[PDB]
């Protein structure tokens, strides 16, 4: 079996991680993505993101790491390190700096 | 060999006695025949039981744990009949050897002999149990006078170098050891493993020794060089280069 | 295993030329991204484990051995008290 | 003409000639490099074992007894802990005795290497070893074994290892 990976996108890096082929949809009919279109609703992308960090079946996130701070409140209350949220890169928008929710715990030290 | 026996059912007066006899013979050989005397006493611990006996029949009140006041005074008596004296070239050399309740050092018989005599062997419960023999335990153990019995003329000149980085590789080993059950073998660094072989090597070989095998202190010196050849000659930090460069090679 | 902590990680198992090139190179993206959630999933599960560890370090040297220490010199005051009175 | 060493101490040039003559095509224009000797990493089976596992190439195994007699093996595999033995019939023994000889594969049995906790050895043929050595690299033996046909490679079939080396090419 094995869990999935999955991921919450800008369009292009949902054709992106889906053409590599990452993600399914369940029996259920339940998806594994969501596309951060550009009229989209801020909590959407907290919705949807609690849903997946409290689903057995995902193992990691992957998350446009501008989405990711559209929900800084939800995504850095994760203490856990059952599903890990990865804050990727985006196209136009710069690319992972510092700000991650993870690195952070090395506060004095990286 | 001069040998006096008090068994555990004679007189004890005569086990006070005794150690008095003993003495005054090594003080006739030493100093009049002017022989190497080496006294050993055995169960100082025996000789304070019948110390408090004759104490309890003088009907005194009895001293610091159950012991006579004067105890000290009196051990102190034994075991300053001894040494080398100026014009006469004989000496008296004393082992005592004693036995400790607890397995507990800060009893009296124990405490008041170690501000009395100059150094400690540490016979250990433990080798012991692991079937070694003798069971001496060199970390604890110390003789405070062992700088001026070796070294050129009086044993080897490596003597000292030799005595100093065994010491220092049985106190890593036995901390290697330890973390070793803690961190698991695979953890463990290239010289840790090092540490780790020379301690089994150290125990069979240098610690453990036949009952009726006798070893002079240069073959022991060369047993001490085996087990040094273990390791890299840049990790025998307590060794001059000197000594390395004379001992640490193997030759025909 | 580091030093009897359990560690979780995660393996990658799997079940035109543009497109193919387009294939290529998001599949070896998602070989980072595998590798890179291990890393995460061991350094947070680590970070907990260190923390537990340090406590149970300060609390023997700052509550535990204290308490023994004065017990064991409350012994010996008493043991010096009942010589006193026989 | 004579080959390339990163450094040497068991051989002179006399030995390095004669050896370079007989070893393989396999490493027949490759610089020697030390991975192993007594004189350098100290004295021990496992760390011949520990700086021998990373290899992927032949070795040369060079050893001088306390009579200073030099001899050893050219083997096709690294010296490694196997259950079987293994090797192929490339690897030979050799003894400066003083004259240098060399005992290559007899073709009887493949019996070339075998590694154990507790030792090293080479050849077989019921309870022969063309060389065995213990785990402290103190105590060794040569006797002939069907393998190579070797004559005893030190001066004694018993003898101590005053200083061993262990060679690859790479």
Redesign the interface.
Known sequence: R??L?AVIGDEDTVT??L????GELNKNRHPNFLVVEKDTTINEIEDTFRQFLNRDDI??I?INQYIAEMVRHALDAHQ??IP?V?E?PSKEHPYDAAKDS?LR?AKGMF | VCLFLNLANDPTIERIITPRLALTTAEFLAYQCEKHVLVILTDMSSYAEALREVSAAREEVPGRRGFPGYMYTDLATIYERAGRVEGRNGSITQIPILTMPNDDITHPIPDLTGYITEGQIYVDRQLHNRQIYPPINVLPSLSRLMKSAIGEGMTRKDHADVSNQLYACYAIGKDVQAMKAVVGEEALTSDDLLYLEFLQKFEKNFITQGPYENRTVYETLDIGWQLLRIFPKEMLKRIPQSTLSEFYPRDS | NVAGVTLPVFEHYHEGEQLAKLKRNYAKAVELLVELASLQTSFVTLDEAIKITNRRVNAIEHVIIPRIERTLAYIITELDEREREE | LPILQSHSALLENMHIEQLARRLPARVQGYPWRLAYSTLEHGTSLKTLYRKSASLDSPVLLVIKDMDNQIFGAYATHPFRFSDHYYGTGETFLYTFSPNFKVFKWSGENSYFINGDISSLELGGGGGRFGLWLDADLYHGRSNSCSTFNNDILSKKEDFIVQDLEVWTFE
């Open positions: 094995g869990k990976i992106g991680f053409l590599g082929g990452i193992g990691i992957l856990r390190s890990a990865l990727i993870i715990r």
